[PDB]
Amino acid sequence: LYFQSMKLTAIETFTNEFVGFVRVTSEDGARGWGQVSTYHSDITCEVLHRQVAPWMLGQDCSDLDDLLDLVTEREHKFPGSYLRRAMAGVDTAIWDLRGKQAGKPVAELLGGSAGTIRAYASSMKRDITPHDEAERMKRLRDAHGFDAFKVRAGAEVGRGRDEWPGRTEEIVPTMRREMGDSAALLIDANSCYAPAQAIELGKLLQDHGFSHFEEPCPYWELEQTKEVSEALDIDVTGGEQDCDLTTWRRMIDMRAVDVVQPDILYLGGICRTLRVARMAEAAALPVTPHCANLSLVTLFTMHLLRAIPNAGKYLEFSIEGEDYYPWQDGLFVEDPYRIEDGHARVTEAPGWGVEICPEWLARSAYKVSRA
Amino acid sequence: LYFQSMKLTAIETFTNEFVGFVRVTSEDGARGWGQVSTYHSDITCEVLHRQVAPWMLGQDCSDLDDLLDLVTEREHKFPGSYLRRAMAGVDTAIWDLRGKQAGKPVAELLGGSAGTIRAYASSMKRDITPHDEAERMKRLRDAHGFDAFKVRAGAEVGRGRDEWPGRTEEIVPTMRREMGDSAALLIDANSCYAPAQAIELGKLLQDHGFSHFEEPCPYWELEQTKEVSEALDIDVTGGEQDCDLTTWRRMIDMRAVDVVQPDILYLGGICRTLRVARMAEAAALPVTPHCANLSLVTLFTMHLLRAIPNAGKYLEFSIEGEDYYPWQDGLFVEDPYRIEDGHARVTEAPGWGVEICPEWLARSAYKVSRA
Ligand SMILES: [Mg+2]
Ligand SMILES: [Mg+2]
Ligand SMILES: [Mg+2]
Ligand SMILES: [Mg+2]
């Protein structure tokens, strides 16, 4: 996968506090759109102009991986999330630009094709009863054709406490009883448990035919997660908060998890996610990326899953409504997230195949850096 | 060390792009002053108001360590530097408040006492010739009585290359020749070398009686640094960019370095630095913190070194002039950094014993969050 030299002459951000989009312009005038990670995106865009753009402007992106490494090296006093959430916006915009120059969706540029991806209906909520959770999943199944469903266990980073006593013990048998025997059932504990409790819960998930046990232990304690993986046959999965490529190497080399789950934007973009996917590929681990919302993170993940040889079983697809993500409304000219028989679809449109809504841009905070 | 319960009712920041100070107010009316980490402090202060203040305001901070842990847990999607740089400003402000309430310097509250600390003259520069480096260190020695001196090796995160060919091979013998046989000589490679290159340099340092070899290898590659420590008799030191307590535990448990070097403000404040010092103490490793300018980070480190039982040999004391740090002129009413016979001194003044210059504050950007 090789690309002619290109120099960026401008990087622009259009943002609010929830989401920010990035437009890059090359010296020949070609332009591409991407997105920084959601959540405090306004801070991320400030970091982008302060600490990413100065190193990327007027440089050759023909080896984008090396350029991104150089950013991390020049900003080595800033290990962590914000720098990477910012890099992700420039990286994703460059992919859009390349796709538009080639007349190919990003998925094709990465060696795949346009086509469908199986989706799982992902609930973000713990303030929902097991009863109501099953009832809405039943409705979503009937309306859109999903055949895979993720719910929540424990309390978010809950130090071993449940959301309320008994919730987790109820939700597991409830989902299997209510969804029937063929539904794929996933759960995510969001760093709640010590290994002893996580293994207990693991046996229960196994008893009820769950096939995906996400983030059972504090994600920063790789030895805890490995102890759980080792004691259980159900797939133990993780990685969504991992933005450090050294930590990724350590997690994969020790096989802490059975399925790796990078977030394309938390990790710092497509290039860096492909590094992780190739580490996992060499380790014979599948890749099932995290996507928390219907900003572009989901679409980026769709393209990735249509390309990588070790794609996991399905796309994470948030089923929360407006009420949950009121900011995610009216981001795009055309909706890229129609679901048909439980599948999402990447089209043959060049680049990401999305346009940012001009009305949303009008209301945005604009900032530009020039070479 | 037990404290009476206290609730913060306001957190205020006063910042520019280079440094920002924090004033905290308790419900009884007492106030304390601290500082976020230098460099992009305006972004750090936004993170403070966005992501630290909401979790600390109106809460009991007597168990300050637990409240800080809670911040990192509520903000678990933001591992890394900015969150910790922000938390550090609140933590150091609370310590100043506690000192002022008790009428005691922070050093005393930590179990130590007012008194002197040996300082080393720390050069930040690689553009300087070894000749010119030796000559200014001699001037500084005669003027201030320093008997320890740190210079730079390699290029900063230089991927194994030198600043220019031969600079490092020249500077090592040049410092020992020119400074004479009794001076303590330290060097810092700022993540430049692969282990075999660092071991080769380590032999040259040993031949010339250097006593401290800092950050020989990329700081994020702990196994590389351990290889170097294991091959050399000279103390290998590091940790200034490490803000993750789990990484600290890993680094200390594997004995990757001989001396640990947290930066109090990068790490997230006094409480979290004491946690690192205690881990190091249990492993019989000394603590020689990083402090690379004459914002309050140097003073905070002076108080810490007056208290911890496993204090290292000396305070890092930047000897760069105003060419170098123009923003550091005119920050404080007092000058807490006079050096005499190569020692700095912590007085009995309550808290940190420093007032921010009223003119500086008048020119600063102000922001407030209230309970
Ligand atoms: Mg998850
Ligand atoms: Mg297993
Ligand atoms: Mg250093
Ligand atoms: Mg050794």
PDB file of N, CA, C and O in Angstrom, chain B residues 12 16 36 70 93 117 125 128-129 133 137 141 156 193 204 248 259 283 294 311 348 363:
ATOM      1  N   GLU B  12     -10.293  28.179  41.153  1.00  0.00           N
ATOM      2  CA  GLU B  12     -10.026  29.234  40.196  1.00  0.00           C
ATOM      3  C   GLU B  12      -8.686  29.025  39.519  1.00  0.00           C
ATOM      4  O   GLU B  12      -7.717  28.586  40.157  1.00  0.00           O
ATOM      5  N   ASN B  16      -1.604  31.614  31.565  1.00  0.00           N
ATOM      6  CA  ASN B  16      -1.324  31.910  30.158  1.00  0.00           C
ATOM      7  C   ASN B  16      -0.957  30.589  29.472  1.00  0.00           C
ATOM      8  O   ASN B  16      -1.211  29.518  30.034  1.00  0.00           O
ATOM      9  N   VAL B  36      -0.663  24.170  37.989  1.00  0.00           N
ATOM     10  CA  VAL B  36      -0.677  23.061  37.035  1.00  0.00           C
ATOM     11  C   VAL B  36       0.706  22.915  36.385  1.00  0.00           C
ATOM     12  O   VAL B  36       1.549  23.828  36.432  1.00  0.00           O
ATOM     13  N   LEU B  70     -10.714   8.715  42.333  1.00  0.00           N
ATOM     14  CA  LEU B  70     -12.054   8.851  41.776  1.00  0.00           C
ATOM     15  C   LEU B  70     -12.093   9.685  40.520  1.00  0.00           C
ATOM     16  O   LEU B  70     -12.755   9.317  39.562  1.00  0.00           O
ATOM     17  N   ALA B  93      -2.561  23.091  45.365  1.00  0.00           N
ATOM     18  CA  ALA B  93      -3.318  24.165  46.025  1.00  0.00           C
ATOM     19  C   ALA B  93      -3.871  23.704  47.386  1.00  0.00           C
ATOM     20  O   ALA B  93      -3.796  24.444  48.377  1.00  0.00           O
ATOM     21  N   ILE B 117      18.654  21.685  50.717  1.00  0.00           N
ATOM     22  CA  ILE B 117      18.694  20.565  49.766  1.00  0.00           C
ATOM     23  C   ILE B 117      19.825  20.840  48.799  1.00  0.00           C
ATOM     24  O   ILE B 117      19.885  21.908  48.157  1.00  0.00           O
ATOM     25  N   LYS B 125      20.270  22.250  27.422  1.00  0.00           N
ATOM     26  CA  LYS B 125      20.623  22.478  26.009  1.00  0.00           C
ATOM     27  C   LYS B 125      21.416  21.362  25.351  1.00  0.00           C
ATOM     28  O   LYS B 125      22.303  20.792  25.966  1.00  0.00           O
ATOM     29  N   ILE B 128      24.465  23.704  22.595  1.00  0.00           N
ATOM     30  CA  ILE B 128      25.688  24.240  23.168  1.00  0.00           C
ATOM     31  C   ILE B 128      26.886  23.295  22.934  1.00  0.00           C
ATOM     32  O   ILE B 128      26.746  22.081  23.037  1.00  0.00           O
ATOM     33  N   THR B 129      28.062  23.851  22.644  1.00  0.00           N
ATOM     34  CA  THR B 129      29.261  23.029  22.457  1.00  0.00           C
ATOM     35  C   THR B 129      29.704  22.496  23.809  1.00  0.00           C
ATOM     36  O   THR B 129      29.450  23.143  24.827  1.00  0.00           O
ATOM     37  N   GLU B 133      29.639  24.607  27.345  1.00  0.00           N
ATOM     38  CA  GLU B 133      28.956  23.961  28.468  1.00  0.00           C
ATOM     39  C   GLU B 133      29.863  23.897  29.704  1.00  0.00           C
ATOM     40  O   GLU B 133      29.460  24.311  30.797  1.00  0.00           O
ATOM     41  N   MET B 137      29.369  26.103  33.320  1.00  0.00           N
ATOM     42  CA  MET B 137      29.283  25.360  34.588  1.00  0.00           C
ATOM     43  C   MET B 137      30.349  25.836  35.579  1.00  0.00           C
ATOM     44  O   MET B 137      30.060  25.967  36.765  1.00  0.00           O
ATOM     45  N   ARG B 141      29.519  27.378  39.174  1.00  0.00           N
ATOM     46  CA  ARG B 141      30.137  26.804  40.356  1.00  0.00           C
ATOM     47  C   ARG B 141      30.755  27.889  41.262  1.00  0.00           C
ATOM     48  O   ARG B 141      30.555  27.901  42.470  1.00  0.00           O
ATOM     49  N   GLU B 156      17.507  14.614  21.451  1.00  0.00           N
ATOM     50  CA  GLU B 156      16.258  14.361  22.177  1.00  0.00           C
ATOM     51  C   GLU B 156      15.355  13.438  21.365  1.00  0.00           C
ATOM     52  O   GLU B 156      15.018  13.755  20.229  1.00  0.00           O
ATOM     53  N   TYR B 193      18.652   6.374  22.882  1.00  0.00           N
ATOM     54  CA  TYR B 193      19.438   5.210  22.459  1.00  0.00           C
ATOM     55  C   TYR B 193      18.752   3.849  22.458  1.00  0.00           C
ATOM     56  O   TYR B 193      17.909   3.568  23.303  1.00  0.00           O
ATOM     57  N   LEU B 204      31.683   4.478  28.746  1.00  0.00           N
ATOM     58  CA  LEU B 204      32.430   5.727  28.665  1.00  0.00           C
ATOM     59  C   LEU B 204      32.145   6.606  29.904  1.00  0.00           C
ATOM     60  O   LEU B 204      33.047   7.233  30.460  1.00  0.00           O
ATOM     61  N   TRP B 248       4.212   2.879  36.843  1.00  0.00           N
ATOM     62  CA  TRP B 248       5.160   3.043  37.938  1.00  0.00           C
ATOM     63  C   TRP B 248       5.364   1.731  38.729  1.00  0.00           C
ATOM     64  O   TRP B 248       6.503   1.345  39.045  1.00  0.00           O
ATOM     65  N   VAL B 259      17.263   4.733  40.200  1.00  0.00           N
ATOM     66  CA  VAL B 259      16.728   5.926  40.871  1.00  0.00           C
ATOM     67  C   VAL B 259      15.442   6.309  40.109  1.00  0.00           C
ATOM     68  O   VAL B 259      15.466   6.378  38.886  1.00  0.00           O
ATOM     69  N   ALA B 283      11.110  -0.846  47.630  1.00  0.00           N
ATOM     70  CA  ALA B 283      12.081  -1.489  46.746  1.00  0.00           C
ATOM     71  C   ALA B 283      13.512  -0.994  46.985  1.00  0.00           C
ATOM     72  O   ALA B 283      14.431  -1.338  46.219  1.00  0.00           O
ATOM     73  N   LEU B 294      11.947  26.987  36.564  1.00  0.00           N
ATOM     74  CA  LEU B 294      11.765  27.671  37.843  1.00  0.00           C
ATOM     75  C   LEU B 294      10.384  28.288  38.005  1.00  0.00           C
ATOM     76  O   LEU B 294      10.224  29.366  38.632  1.00  0.00           O
ATOM     77  N   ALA B 311      14.702  10.184  49.862  1.00  0.00           N
ATOM     78  CA  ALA B 311      15.147  11.269  48.965  1.00  0.00           C
ATOM     79  C   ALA B 311      16.454  10.917  48.290  1.00  0.00           C
ATOM     80  O   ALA B 311      17.367  10.380  48.943  1.00  0.00           O
ATOM     81  N   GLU B 348      10.589  28.120  56.931  1.00  0.00           N
ATOM     82  CA  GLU B 348       9.425  27.769  57.727  1.00  0.00           C
ATOM     83  C   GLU B 348       8.095  28.479  57.280  1.00  0.00           C
ATOM     84  O   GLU B 348       7.049  28.330  57.931  1.00  0.00           O
ATOM     85  N   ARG B 363      -2.716  40.307  34.488  1.00  0.00           N
ATOM     86  CA  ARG B 363      -2.592  40.025  33.055  1.00  0.00           C
ATOM     87  C   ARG B 363      -3.081  38.633  32.623  1.00  0.00           C
ATOM     88  O   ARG B 363      -3.254  38.407  31.438  1.00  0.00           O
TER      89      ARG B 363
END
